[PDB]
Amino acid sequence: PRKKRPEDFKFGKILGEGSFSTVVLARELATSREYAIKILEKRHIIKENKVPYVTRERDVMSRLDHPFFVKLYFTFQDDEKLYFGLSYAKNGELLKYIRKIGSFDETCTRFYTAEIVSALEYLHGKGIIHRDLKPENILLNEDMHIQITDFGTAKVLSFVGTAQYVSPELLTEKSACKSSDLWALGCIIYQLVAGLPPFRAGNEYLIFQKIIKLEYDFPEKFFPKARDLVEKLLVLDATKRLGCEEMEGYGPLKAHPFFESVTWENLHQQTPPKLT
Numbered sequence: 001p002r003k004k005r006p007e008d009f010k011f012g013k014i015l016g017e018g019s020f021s022t023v024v025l026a027r028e029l030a031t032s033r034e035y036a037i038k039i040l041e042k043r044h045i046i047k048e049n050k051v052p053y054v055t056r057e058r059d060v061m062s063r064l065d066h067p068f069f070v071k072l073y074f075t076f077q078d079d080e081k082l083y084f085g086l087s088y089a090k091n092g093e094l095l096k097y098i099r100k101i102g103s104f105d106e107t108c109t110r111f112y113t114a115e116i117v118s119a120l121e122y123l124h125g126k127g128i129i130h131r132d133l134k135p136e137n138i139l140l141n142e143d144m145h146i147q148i149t150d151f152g153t154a155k156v157l158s159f160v161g162t163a164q165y166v167s168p169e170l171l172t173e174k175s176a177c178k179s180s181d182l183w184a185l186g187c188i189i190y191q192l193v194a195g196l197p198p199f200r201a202g203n204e205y206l207i208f209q210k211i212i213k214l215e216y217d218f219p220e221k222f223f224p225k226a227r228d229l230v231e232k233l234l235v236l237d238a239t240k241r242l243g244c245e246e247m248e249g250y251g252p253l254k255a256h257p258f259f260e261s262v263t264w265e266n267l268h269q270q271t272p273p274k275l276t
């Protein structure tokens, strides 16, 4: 089809700024479609030795075809920049709703947790480890269904993701795996229900000390079935986390009492519960 150029677009406001990128809202002049265009500067990529990560990311986004992930429509580059045309997730980051509404009720916690597990099942199925899952990476579309992004740092089957969602193995033998993603899910489930991440401290080194020592507590408010699930994900021994291959995969995880009423088969077709 048509190989796109910057002039083919009417760029608008900035949707997000990373250390190596800026996602900008663009409207395609010929169709009026809105896209979230990720813009990367070749110079900064090179001098910062990031080529391996930019290639990785595009190559993962090529292999993914599922509704809970931001899609890559096209790419193009100019003299000093690379451009990736991605799905524009209208409602933005999930972190905003957590902060906006405070915390989630059980219905919302279960529906959104189910969408995350279904998306992890898919990703793990292609042999890709996100390695940096967090509420800032999980977006909500026009219909409030999740749309996961930020794959520059994924591992296809070195680094350390956001301090509070990093698992123990990384802080030790520095090696992450599929269970690293499950650790982050436990952290995120806790965060949805409590309104706050489980391992938190004044500084990063302190956050790390807690993680390795598994120093965190559950508020009395915490729904008990969600709590039982969180204790099955927040495990130091990665071969013991509900969801990993040694624990027989997603079947047992999906079969958790917390998910009793979920219909796993058509979630994105389902009307998400109203965030209150």
Ligand SMILES: CC(C)(C(N)=O)C(=O)NCCCNc1nc(Nc2cccc(NC(=O)N3CCCC3)c2)ncc1Br
Residues within 6 Å of the ligand: 015, 016, 017, 018, 019, 021, 022, 023, 036, 038, 070, 086, 087, 088, 089, 090, 091, 092, 093, 096, 136, 137, 139, 149, 150
């Ligand atoms: C990877 C990274 C760091 C980036 N900037 O490249 C990134 O932030 N990705 C997610 C957001 C941008 N990408 C994207 N953002 C949206 N949608 C969207 C729509 C409205 C608001 C926001 N942004 C926020 O809510 N933010 C909270 C405060 C600042 C952003 C994001 N859709 C697709 C992408 Br790809």
Ligand SMILES: [Cl-]
Residues within 6 Å of the ligand: 023, 038, 149, 150
């Ligand atoms: Cl992004």
